[PDB]
């Protein structure tokens, strides 16, 4: 009943050492080489995308700069200060949620603790997460602290949209850029996570989850929580097949490929998918028109774009050259007429249906 509260896999499997960070070889190796030696810039800016490890890596630097052993690229395992940072409470690291602290009446006070003595352990070090929300005057206070930083302190920094910071602080800070995870990285990490606790898994579900994650690991973990929920403690292909209605993307090219002939159930299946998905019909037909126009461009130039649909550079080319240009022009006329009259149809689904039927009516 009220027992066994499996908290989120986003929080439970949060890395503890630099060996538990998936991907980002460049940042990990750079900081590992920089920690053995004393050349440490007074401010480390971390930037990336949604849910990669900027906050996790910052926790790792708080782990490393503060230990009984000392500044170590290698982890600590267990030692009081870094032990303390496994959980929330910790004395010489203060995590200013800069989103909740944007005004100077708060951030000036928080930075005013830099001139106090550090707590247990060296390197009074604080992590100002999501710096891009600081006010202009808050940034001025941060700049005045950075230009003459106390030697006994350092402080990390994180964000998601680095373009909003002033050029002065960006130039000062030794920015590390954290890359979006590749599909293989996320897939292998999710495999490891599922194997770690108890949940069986089949590979196709995991490729689907990785593809739908769009690169963020936290996104992959949220979707694996949902997959476990829907699959009743088993991430099989069926729960992720229910997710497939959301992750199914390639739809505009298949209809273009099926327009030039009578494929039978292909058009009906594709229109059913479009209706059950409810994407913008005007945008759907504009994508149709763009594909058809670049096809006409390829007809008069054997390699007109080349970079268009590199995954479909073995099927789109056939209709890019085999189909007569006159038929392509007629199809363009049909789709243009359909778009021009689309909003006045009884429903835009009916309008796109009628455009497809007119296209299939001729050849």
């Amino acid at each position: 009943g009220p027992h066994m509260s499996y908290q989120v896999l986003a929080r439970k499997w949060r890395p503890q050492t630099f060996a538990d960070v998936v991907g980002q070889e460049h940042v990990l190796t750079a900081l590992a080489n920089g920690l053995s030696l004393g050349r440490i810039h007074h401010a480390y800016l971390f930037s990336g995308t949604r849910g990669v490890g900027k906050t996790s890596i910052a926790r790792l630097l708080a782990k490393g700069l503060n230990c009984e052993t000392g500044i170590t690229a290698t982890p600590c395992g267990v030692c009081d200060n870094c032990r303390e940072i496994e959980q929330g409470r910790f004395v010489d690291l203060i995590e200013i949620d800069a989103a909740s602290r944007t005004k100077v009446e708060d951030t000036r006070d928080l930075l005013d603790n830099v001139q106090y003595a550090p707590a247990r352990g060296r390197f009074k070090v604080y992590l100002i997460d999501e710096v891009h929300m600081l006010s202009r005057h808050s940034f001025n206070a941060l700049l005045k602290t950075l230009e003459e930083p106390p030697e006994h302190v350092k402080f990390l920094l994180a964000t998601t949209d680095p373009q909003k910071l002033p050029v002065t602080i960006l130039s000062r800070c030794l920015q590390f850029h954290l890359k979006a995870l590749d599909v293989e990285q996320i897939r292998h990490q999710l495999e490891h996570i599922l194997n770690e606790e108890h949940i069986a898994h089949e590979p196709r579900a995991l490729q689907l989850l990785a593809r739908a994650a769009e690169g963020s690991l936290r996104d992959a973990l949220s979707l694996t929580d949902q997959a476990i929920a829907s699959g009743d403690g088993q991430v099989s292909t069926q729960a992720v097949s229910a997710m497939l209605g959301t992750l199914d993307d390639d739809q505009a090219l298949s209809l273009v490929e099926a327009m030039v002939e009578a494929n039978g159930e292909r058009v009906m299946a594709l229109i059913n998918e479009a209706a059950a998905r409810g994407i913008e019909w005007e945008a759907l037909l504009v994508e149709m028109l763009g594909l058809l126009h670049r096809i006409a461009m390829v007809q008069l130039s054997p390699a007109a774009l080349g970079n268009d649909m590199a995954a479909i550079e073995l099927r789109m080319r056939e209709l890019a050259r085999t189909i007569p240009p006159t038929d392509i022009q007629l199809y363009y006329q049909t789709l243009l007429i359909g778009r021009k009259e689309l909003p006045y149809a009884p429903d835009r689904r009916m309008g796109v249906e009628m455009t497809l039927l007119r296209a299939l009516a001729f050849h």
Binding site: R101, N113, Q115, Y116, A117, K144, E148
Partner: protein, 369 residues
């Protein structure tokens, strides 16, 4: 789990709550820091309030029955509950389950609390320099040299007082930049030498907690913190890093010229010289002649008036000591009856003391045009 029992009166509870919740204004990073720690240990109430920089702990005797425990209460709400209740009314408190219930006979409130384990405390240390200074002496030390602090300075250590000790005497350095101030009062007992930086806010709280009573102030200075005790009240404050350098160098080594005048006479004369015609742009211009102080007026509105003051003068003639604001700061905090001033050189600084006392020495470097 814990269930404490308060049985107290307003008059013996209002002041400790004020002293513990004064500095606790604003929104702190941990929500528990915006909260006030209540501890019922033996026949004693401990009220704790922090800002990650200073801790105020008030002790209240519990003559009526009580139960030990520890909890935390929203400081503003609890203070407003205790305030406004009828004079002489008795507050009873029972912390049941999650909520704390306060009662005054015909009134009952249920306040939400936070667990006592979450509340941070400052770790124990060794107090190197412990002394029991007279409260009035500490008040004089703070006030005679507190008007010069240089709050909000780039040095990030000029913002705080310095305290130095030697044998049975101590001094308070008012690190300011263009201003210096020192005060030499005795301790009455031998103490080791130690230099300590105390933040501005800590100094303000330490002078406010004096209350002007007779109880001697027991002050303990350690390596990274200071503590003060007055009656049943305890104050704790961390220290600033960095060491301010020697201050005796800025003092005039060879004050070739001297001045002397009544404290009230100088007070009125320079008050006029600062409010009559010298307000914003530089201001006074000083010409020290034999028993003559010629003051020239400079201001944006071009009111230019010259006034002559009769002040006893040892020397021939000098000019260009006319830093009006800082000498005003010195004059207001002189607390003298007859004032003796040392001037060595226009380029160097100017010292001010009492004619027959050295309770406060002031150093002000004049500005040049």
């Amino acid at each position: 789990g814990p269930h404490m029992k308060f049985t107290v009166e307003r008059e013996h509870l209002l002041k400790p709550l004020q002293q513990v919740s004064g500095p606790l204004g604003g929104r702190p990073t941990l929500p528990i820091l915006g909260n006030l720690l209540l501890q019922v240990a033996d026949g004693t109430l401990s009220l704790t309030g922090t800002d990650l920089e200073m801790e105020m702990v008030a002790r209240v005797a519990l003559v009526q029955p009580h139960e030990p425990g520890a909890t935390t209460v929203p400081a503003r709400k609890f203070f407003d509950i205790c305030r406004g209740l009828p004079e002489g009314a008795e507050i009873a408190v029972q912390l049941e389950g999650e909520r704390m219930l306060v009662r005054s006979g015909r009134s009952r409130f249920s306040l939400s609390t936070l667990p006592a384990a979450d509340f941070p405390n400052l770790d124990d240390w060794q107090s190197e320099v412990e002394f029991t200074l007279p409260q009035a002496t500490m008040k004089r030390l703070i006030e005679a040299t507190q008007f010069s602090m240089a709050h909000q300075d780039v040095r990030y250590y000029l913002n705080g007082m310095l305290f130095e000790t030697e044998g049975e005497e101590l001094r308070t350095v008012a690190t300011d930049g263009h201003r210096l101030a020192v005060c030499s009062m005795p301790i009455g007992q031998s103490l080791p030498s130690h230099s300590v930086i105390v933040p501005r806010k800590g100094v303000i709280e330490l002078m406010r907690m004096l209350d002007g009573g007779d109880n001697p102030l027991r002050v303990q200075i350690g390596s990274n913190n200071i503590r003060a005790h007055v009656g049943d009240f305890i104050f704790t404050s961390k220290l600033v890093d960095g060491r301010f350098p020697d201050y005796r160098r800025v003092l005039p080594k060879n004050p070739d010229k001297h001045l002397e005048a009544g404290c009230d006479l100088l007070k009125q004369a320079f008050a006029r010289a600062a409010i009559l015609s010298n307000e914003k742009f530089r201001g006074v211009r000083l010409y020290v002649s034999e028993n003559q102080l010629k003051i020239t007026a400079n201001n944006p509105e071009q009111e230019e008036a010259e006034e002559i003051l009769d002040v006893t003068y040892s020397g021939a003639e000098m000019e260009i000591g006319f830093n009006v604001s800082y000498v005003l700061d010195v004059l207001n905090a002189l607390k003298c009856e007859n004032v003796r001033m040392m001037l060595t050189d226009s380029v160097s600084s100017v010292q001010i003391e009492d004619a027959a006392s050295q309770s406060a020495a002031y150093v002000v470097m004049p500005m040049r045009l």
